[PDB]
Amino acid sequence: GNVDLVFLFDGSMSLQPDEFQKILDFMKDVMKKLSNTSYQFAAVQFSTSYKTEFDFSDYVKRKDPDALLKHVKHMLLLTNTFGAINYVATEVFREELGARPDATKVLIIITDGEATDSGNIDAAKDIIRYIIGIGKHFQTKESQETLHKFASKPASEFVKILDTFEKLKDLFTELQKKIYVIE
Amino acid sequence: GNVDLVFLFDGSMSLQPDEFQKILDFMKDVMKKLSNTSYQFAAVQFSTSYKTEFDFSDYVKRKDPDALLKHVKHMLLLTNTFGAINYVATEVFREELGARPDATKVLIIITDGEATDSGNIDAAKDIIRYIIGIGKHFQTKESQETLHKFASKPASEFVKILDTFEKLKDLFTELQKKIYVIE
Ligand SMILES: [Cl-]
Ligand SMILES: [Cl-]
Ligand SMILES: [Mn+2]
Ligand SMILES: [Mn+2]
């Protein structure tokens, strides 16, 4: 059926210009591949606070991915992941913002560091949540587990750990192998 | 998993140059949208006889549909669909020709007239068969009914009827709404 997918990307102080660009490229690639499908998209940059770069209505109005993200500016601040996730659940997934009523909700969280805040993401528990942890900040198994709480279960399918930002290209390659025209 | 898909397109005399071109356009549109996925394609033109325009190996070596179908010459003869389907079953789905051993076999038959031969297609029965009947030769319930025996069950899912070749543009729009990234 319909799929309303939200990209919640890390814009923290740790990211180098090229790394931030690779995150933007990844989001665009998936969007272009899935253009003219039953998917609709929204994008929110998060660091210390949260900013919807374009919401569902924006995408519907102008499907152009490159145009939708042409305005993004790297925040360069903290990594308040609990707040960011709750922000999507209540401020982005809204009918008035273009979200479709009984559409399946999906969240693709991309981050390069552990969350600097805490609390709960209970309000977002019914959204299908994928998280992509990139870079040396996720070298240890300990740091990787910290991401499970944000993603759906099992972690084996929903939590993806990438050692480099270059690997985002590999991940896109792999996701395309999972694309099918369903009966 | 892996999907080996063969397009079997009508090259009969009834087809005008632009109608035959729209059939090719449909095939290429499909292939382009499904590029870099688990799908691999082969195309066979049929009329009085049959011709593999490119096989699975060719597709793999040069994944460019436009380049893959540039030499196609409209046969302009009859409509031997029974023989054609049997040819795909035994002369196209072959590992030496690029077909993957246990990939799901799918056959997309595109035609604008009733078969001019008879027999059976028992040998192609394990292949998921879709048939697209286009035009004036299918304006009666009887003519449309004859297409059923070539496709998988139920006909309501595997038989597609288009009043015009223009409609192949519509059909492609429709099928894309069924494109999803599987878990
Ligand atoms: Cl950081
Ligand atoms: Cl004909
Ligand atoms: Mn960071
Ligand atoms: Mn014909």
Q: In chain A, whose CA is at the least distance from the CA of B174?
A: A37
- For residue B6, give both structure tokens: 């063969």
CA distances from B133 to A13, A116, A174, B162 (A): 58, 60, 35, 6
- Give the Å distance between the CA of B23 and the centre of ligand 4: 12
The 3-state DSSP class for residue A111 equals: strand
Q: Experimental method for this entry?
A: X-ray
Q: Which domains does chain A have, with CATH numbers?
A: 1-183 (3.40.50.410)
Residue B179 distance to chain A (closest CA, Å): 4
Cβ of B38 and A180 within 8 Å? yes
- Give the Å distance between the CA of A9 and the centre of ligand 3: 10
Q: Which amino acid belongs to residue A62? A: R
The 3-state DSSP class for residue A139 equals: coil
Tell me the C-alpha distance between B94 and B42, whole Å: 11
The continuous run of DSSP H or E covering B105 comes out as strand B104-111
Which residues, 6+ apart, have CB-to-CB distance to B110 below 8 Å? B7, B8, B9, B10, B23, B26, B27, B131, B132, B134
- For residue A31, give both structure tokens: 């969007």
Q: In chain A, whose CA is at the least distance from the CA of B182?
A: A178
CA distances from A121 to A11, A80, A156, A165, B10 (A): 20, 12, 20, 26, 56
- For residue A44, give both structure tokens: 């929110």
**Count of beta carbons in the 10 Å neighbourhood of residue A151:** 21
**Start-to-end CA span in chain B (Å):** 11
Indicate the DSSP class of residue A178: T
Indicate the DSSP class of residue A101: T
Instruction: Mutation target for B interface from A33, A129, A180: give the one with most B CBs within 10 A.
Output: A180
Indicate the DSSP class of residue A77: B
From the list B157, B179, B181, the residue facing A175 with the nearest CB is B181
Taking the alpha carbons of A9, A13, A19, A24 in that order, is the dihedral positive or negative? positive
SS3 content of chain A, % helix, strand, coil (to 5): 40, 25, 35
Which residues, 6+ apart, have CB-to-CB distance to A134 below 8 Å? A19, A110, A111, A112, A161, A162, A163, A164, A165, A167, A168
Which residues, 6+ apart, have CB-to-CB distance to B28 below 8 Å? B65, B66, B69
Radius of gyration (Cα) for chain A, nearest Å? Answer: 15
Q: Which amino acid belongs to residue B133? A: G
- Give the Å distance between the CA of A16 and the centre of ligand 3: 10
Tell me the C-alpha distance between A79 and A77, whole Å: 7
Residue B157 distance to chain A (closest CA, Å): 8
Question: CA B63: distance to chain centroid?
Answer: 18
Cβ of B181 and A178 within 8 Å? yes
